[PDB]
Amino acid sequence: TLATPAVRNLAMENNIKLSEVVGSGKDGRILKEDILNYLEKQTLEHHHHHH
Amino acid sequence: QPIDADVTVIGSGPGGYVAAIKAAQLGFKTVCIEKNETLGGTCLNVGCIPSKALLNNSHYYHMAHGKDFASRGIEMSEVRLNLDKMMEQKSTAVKALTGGIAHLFKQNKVVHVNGYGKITGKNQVTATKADGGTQVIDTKNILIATGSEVTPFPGITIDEDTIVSSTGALSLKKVPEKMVVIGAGVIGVELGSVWQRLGADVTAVEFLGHVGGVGIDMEISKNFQRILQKQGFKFKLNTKVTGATKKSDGKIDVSIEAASGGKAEVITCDVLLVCIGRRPFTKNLGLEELGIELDPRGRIPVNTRFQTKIPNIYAIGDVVAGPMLAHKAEDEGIICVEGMAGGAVHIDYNCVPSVIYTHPEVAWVGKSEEQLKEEGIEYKVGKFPFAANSRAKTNADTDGMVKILGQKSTDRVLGAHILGPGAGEMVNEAALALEYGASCEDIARVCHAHPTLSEAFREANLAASFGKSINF
Amino acid sequence: PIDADVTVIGSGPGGYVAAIKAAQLGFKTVCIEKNETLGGTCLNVGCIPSKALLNNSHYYHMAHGKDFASRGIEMSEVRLNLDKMMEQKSTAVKALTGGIAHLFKQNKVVHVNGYGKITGKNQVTATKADGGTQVIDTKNILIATGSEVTPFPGITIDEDTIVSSTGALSLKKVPEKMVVIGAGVIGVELGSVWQRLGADVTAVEFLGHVGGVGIDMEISKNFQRILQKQGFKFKLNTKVTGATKKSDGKIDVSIEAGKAEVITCDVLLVCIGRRPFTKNLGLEELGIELDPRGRIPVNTRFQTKIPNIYAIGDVVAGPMLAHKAEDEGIICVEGMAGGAVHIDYNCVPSVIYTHPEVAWVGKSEEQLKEEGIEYKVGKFPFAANSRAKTNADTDGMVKILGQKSTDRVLGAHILGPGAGEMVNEAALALEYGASCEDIARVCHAHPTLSEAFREANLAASFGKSINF
Numbered sequence: 001t002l003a004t005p006a007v008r009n010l011a012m013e014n015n016i017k018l019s020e021v022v023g024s025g026k027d028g029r030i031l032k033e034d035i036l037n038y039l040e041k042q043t044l045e046h047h048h049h050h051h
Numbered sequence: 052q053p054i055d056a057d058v059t060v061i062g063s064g065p066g067g068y069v070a071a072i073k074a075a076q077l078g079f080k081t082v083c084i085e086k087n088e089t090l091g092g093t094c095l096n097v098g099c100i101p102s103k104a105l106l107n108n109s110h111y112y113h114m115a116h117g118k119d120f121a122s123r124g125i126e127m128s129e130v131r132l133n134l135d136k137m138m139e140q141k142s143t144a145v146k147a148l149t150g151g152i153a154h155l156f157k158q159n160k161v162v163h164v165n166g167y168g169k170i171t172g173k174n175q176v177t178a179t180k181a182d183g184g185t186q187v188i189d190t191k192n193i194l195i196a197t198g199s200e201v202t203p204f205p206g207i208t209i210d211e212d213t214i215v216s217s218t219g220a221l222s223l224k225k226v227p228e229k230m231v232v233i234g235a236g237v238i239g240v241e242l243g244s245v246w247q248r249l250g251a252d253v254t255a256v257e258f259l260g261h262v263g264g265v266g267i268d269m270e271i272s273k274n275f276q277r278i279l280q281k282q283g284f285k286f287k288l289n290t291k292v293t294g295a296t297k298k299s300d301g302k303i304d305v306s307i308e309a310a311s312g313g314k315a316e317v318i319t320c321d322v323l324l325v326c327i328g329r330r331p332f333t334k335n336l337g338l339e340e341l342g343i344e345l346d347p348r349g350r351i352p353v354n355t356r357f358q359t360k361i362p363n364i365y366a367i368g369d370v371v372a373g374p375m376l377a378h379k380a381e382d383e384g385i386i387c388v389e390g391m392a393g394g395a396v397h398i399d400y401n402c403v404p405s406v407i408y409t410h411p412e413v414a415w416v417g418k419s420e421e422q423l424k425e426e427g428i429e430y431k432v433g434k435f436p437f438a439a440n441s442r443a444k445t446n447a448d449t450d451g452m453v454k455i456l457g458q459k460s461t462d463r464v465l466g467a468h469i470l471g472p473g474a475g476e477m478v479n480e481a482a483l484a485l486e487y488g489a490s491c492e493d494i495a496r497v498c499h500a501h502p503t504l505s506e507a508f509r510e511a512n513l514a515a516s517f518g519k520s521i522n523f
Numbered sequence: 524p525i526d527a528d529v530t531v532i533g534s535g536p537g538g539y540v541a542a543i544k545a546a547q548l549g550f551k552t553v554c555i556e557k558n559e560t561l562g563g564t565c566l567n568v569g570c571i572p573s574k575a576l577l578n579n580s581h582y583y584h585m586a587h588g589k590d591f592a593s594r595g596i597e598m599s600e601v602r603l604n605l606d607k608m609m610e611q612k613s614t615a616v617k618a619l620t621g622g623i624a625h626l627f628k629q630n631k632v633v634h635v636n637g638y639g640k641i642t643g644k645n646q647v648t649a650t651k652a653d654g655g656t657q658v659i660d661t662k663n664i665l666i667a668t669g670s671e672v673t674p675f676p677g678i679t680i681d682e683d684t685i686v687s688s689t690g691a692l693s694l695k696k697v698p699e700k701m702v703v704i705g706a707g708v709i710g711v712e713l714g715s716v717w718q719r720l721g722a723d724v725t726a727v728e729f730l731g732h733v734g735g736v737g738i739d740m741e742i743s744k745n746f747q748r749i750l751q752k753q754g755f756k757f758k759l760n761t762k763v764t765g766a767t768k769k770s771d772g773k774i775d776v777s778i779e780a781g782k783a784e785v786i787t788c789d790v791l792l793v794c795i796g797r798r799p800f801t802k803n804l805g806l807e808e809l810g811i812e813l814d815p816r817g818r819i820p821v822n823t824r825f826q827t828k829i830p831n832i833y834a835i836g837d838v839v840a841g842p843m844l845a846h847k848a849e850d851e852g853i854i855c856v857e858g859m860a861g862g863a864v865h866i867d868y869n870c871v872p873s874v875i876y877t878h879p880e881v882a883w884v885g886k887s888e889e890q891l892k893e894e895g896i897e898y899k900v901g902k903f904p905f906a907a908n909s910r911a912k913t914n915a916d917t918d919g920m921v922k923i924l925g926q927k928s929t930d931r932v933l934g935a936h937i938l939g940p941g942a943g944e945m946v947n948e949a950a951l952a953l954e955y956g957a958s959c960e961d962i963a964r965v966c967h968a969h970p971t972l973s974e975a976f977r978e979a980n981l982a983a984s985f986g987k988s989i990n991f
């Protein structure tokens with residue numbers, strides 16, 4: 001499970017578990033843009049079809 | 052005396068000789084065919100190596116002849132140039148490196164065929180030596196690495212005497228009093244700067260509006276140009292050359308005019324260097340008979356595995372698309388040959404670095420500000436000047452800066468541009484950062500040795516990330 | 524009558540950088556400096572003046588010797604003007620120290636010139652050179668008091684003939700014979716400098732290898748060999764019984780494994796090491812306990828027993844390097860501000876600025892054995908590197924140590940040209956937990972020295988380089 005200090009801080013700062021973010025970088029590294037993508041899909045989610 | 056082989060490589064330039072060595076290391080029965088007296092191609096014989104040598108030597112001559120050394124308390128009586136000796140040091144480097152390739156070929160059991168290669172069949176290459184002595188090679192794969200040649204300038208005819216290409220410029224028998232360079236790209240600037248250092252009065256004439264060729268960052272280019280002019284290097288940009296004529300005294304009248312129109316004038320020189328570019332070399336290789344057509348620029352078309360229209364025939368290096376650089380050709384030769392062993396084949400040209408080995412040096416990798424604006428990418432900018440870098444200051448070598456381009460919101464590094472001391476080496480750290488998809492902050496948190504030039508690289512990234520650096 | 528959020532004591536690489544960062548993050552910041560100029564050991568008597576002289580002496584050596592002649596640069600006479608050389612050194616130092624002042628100004632860092640003592644858990648007192656004190660009331664204290672020259676038991680430094688670093692850096696004339704005690708990083712640098720300028724130089728060293736602690740032995744060995752061909756002489760596995768100043772001005776040096784012997788020198792350099800400087804600081808007066816060598820114990824946030832008083836730099840455990848100090852300063856103040864704090868010293872690079880240079884980051888071979896790790900070895904010589912070869916500058920090699928199982932890079936060691944700059948690429952690779960193979964597949968510009976690094980990784984990964 002690969003992620004730099006800065007990426008780990010961003011995740012922790014926004015209370016994101018690293019296990020629920022799939023990386024897009026080399027060998028599945030988790031990049032800042034992945035934390036940001038997740039944070040953004042997390043807001044759009046409140047408007048997705050469900051029941 | 053025919054020969055069977057798994058991979059036949061035509062050309063021993065950076066692309067050919069590396070692909071050959073590698074093909075052998077992977078178990079392929081490997082033949083490499085080269086028409087010239089020595090291996091190593093354009094880079095080693097008349098390119099990278101001799102120019103870098105002259106760039107080194109002429110730089111030291113400038114330091115000695117000038118104020119640099121004297122400010123350091125190295126007082127030398129009377130500094131004189133011995134051009135022959137200087138050229139000797141250059142040839143020595145070429146000899147050793149070209150000879151070294153023969154050695155590596157022998158060590159890896161690469162079969163070296165000396166003659167002009169022509170593809171005489173979908174699975175056959177024929178080499179014809181000078182004396183007409185022929186040699187046939189039946190092979191599974193053919194790798195075309197036939198490189199590039201000087202692009203001629205219409206009207207002006209190169210004689211490698213007073214009208215020279217890069218090749219003649221690297222072996223002038225005396226410092227020209229006055230020299231004009233047609234083209235202010237990477238290679239023209241380097242060779243121009245060399246002779247300027249040695250005492251030549253030098254002017255480069257360029258049709259476009261900036262020095263340094265395609266992809267260089269506008270601000271980097273402008274600062275570079277400015278510094279070169281301070282050194283005495285002269286430029287006429289947005290200028291066209293209409294012709295040149297040999298006068299009766301031997302000197303040369305070059306006629307120019309604005310690229311837009313008019314302002315027609317005439318500059319006179321002792322030596323004229325035509326340096327407008329290079330182009331793919333495929334002469335008498337037999338592509339026609341094979342039905343392999345070229346693109347409108349002379350390049351052999353290839354897919355992402357470097358295969359041509361004919362699945363077992365491959366091409367790499369200067370002879371195909373992409374940056375015409377030696378490390379690009381080598382990479383291509385490696386991954387192509389890996390592909391023939393069933394490997395994956397992936398290269399991104401946006402990750403290939405460029406360097407100008409002048410002083411200051413210029414190096415960059417990735418995307419320029421202009422390339423970012425025209426792709427509609429949103430970005431931030433961090434800069435750090437070598438003036439505030441400790442090792443640069445301590446050496447009184449303070450021209451230039453590092454400029455980092457980051458994506459505005461993902462902090463992803465998009466490009467890194469260096470003008471100043473140690474740029475060539477420094478850009479490789481940036482290359483590595485790109486491979487890993489580094490963010491500006493990432494580089495900022497990595498411990499860098501102090502005092503080193505590389506801290507300027509660190510600081511620049513810190514400024515891009517945090518908005519502020521520490522020492523500027 | 525003045526107070527702040529953070530008070531840093533000492534303006535070293537550690538303190539000044541911590542100061543500037545403290546300010547930038549929104550902290551009312553004060554920095555206290557006993558000395559006349561800012562900078563600490565690095566800028567005034569350390570990195571900057573030694574690198575200066577290494578540069579000027581390297582150039583002198585090239586002009587005076589065979590090098591420039593082989594390039595077709597010919598000269599009548601090459602004469603040294605040591606005053607001018609020293610002057611250039613000084614210009615560099617004045618400029619850099621002044622830059623820090625301008626930086627404090629720019630960042631609104633309050634500079635206080637005086638010997639500071641910690642009088643209360645939230646109060647620091649700075650006693651000027653004329654008695655007139657100045658007091659600071661503060662929520663946080665950061666101790667960056669750095670280090671001093673460690674004296675040699677029974678040898679008496681007078682910065683004259685028996686000089687320390689400081690003295691060796693400012694000699695007034697070139698010594699005919701010079702003896703260096705300690706063949707560590709600094710010791711070799713300063714010796715080389717004078718060795719280049721004329722001095723017959725001899726270093727004497729208790730341990731059995733030049734380079735200080737942590738250097739890979741293969742590298743240390745080739746490095747020493749190379750220095751020897753330059754004329755730098757070594758007595759290793761040797762003890763210095765003591766030094767005897769003699770009457771004709773010279774100095775006899777008592778040495779021994781136990782096979783006694785004596786060597787005479789015109790100047791003696793005492794470079795056995797450095798130690799944390801904590802004198803009259805108010806630690807004993809506050810309940811703060813040191814370790815045997817004299818460092819201020821701290822946790823993974825750099826705070827002492829007293830959770831609002833931190834310490835960093837040479838005054839703490841870890842490699843006594845400027846960039847180590849600067850990094851610590853930064854992550855320390857980030858931590859005061861609620862941020863995370865971690866620094867792995869295995870990822871702190873080291874550099875020797877002789878020619879050829881030496882530099883490394885991560886684990887030596889010995890370290891890997893002493894920890895029982897299974898590893899591979901890739902090497903590549905600068906003799907086969909195009910850039911090195913074209914400049915006729917071919918000594919040394921790059922050594923990569925990778926892990927047998929995961930092909931991960933564990934150590935990088937560089938001997939030869941551009942090693943100082945090159946190790947920073949190695950550092951960046953470690954941070955990403957790069958495999959040797961990944962590095963080999965990163966396109967490096969040709970011709971560059973950095974290709975030796977690329978190739979050494981290729982060799983560690985696959986078994987073979989291309990160009991060797």
Ligand SMILES: Cc1cc2nc3c(=O)[nH]c(=O)nc-3n(C[C@H](O)[C@H](O)[C@H](O)COP(=O)(O)OP(=O)(O)OC[C@H]3O[C@@H](n4cnc5c(N)ncnc54)[C@H](O)[C@@H]3O)c2cc1C
Nearest residue numbers: 062064065066086092093094098168198368369375376377
């Ligand atoms: C003055 C100068 C300076 C340069 N500096 C740099 C630099 O600093 N950094 C950098 O990266 N690049 C530099 N280059 C560019 C670099 O030289 C080229 O990118 C590089 O040589 C490309 O290599 P290649 O293997 O594709 O082709 P080439 O190097 O051109 O090799 C082609 C080889 O194939 C042989 N050949 C061609 N056809 C046949 C045939 N039919 N049969 C047998 N043999 C054949 C040729 O004789 C030649 O040896 C410089 C170039 C010049 C001219």
Ligand SMILES: Cc1cc2nc3c(=O)[nH]c(=O)nc-3n(C[C@H](O)[C@H](O)[C@H](O)COP(=O)(O)OP(=O)(O)OC[C@H]3O[C@@H](n4cnc5c(N)ncnc54)[C@H](O)[C@@H]3O)c2cc1C
Nearest residue numbers: 533535537557563564565569639668669836837843844845
């Ligand atoms: C000759 C030499 C060459 C070196 N070269 C290198 C090199 O190339 N690379 C490298 O990384 N390192 C090098 N170093 C080591 C480097 O100088 C130190 O590691 C670095 O100085 C550590 O900085 P610091 O902030 O921790 O302490 P220092 O730099 O020593 O700064 C501490 C400052 O705090 C001040 N101070 C102490 N106590 C008080 C007090 N009570 N009140 C007020 N002020 C106080 C001191 O006056 C001093 O100015 C070299 C050292 C020497 C001697």
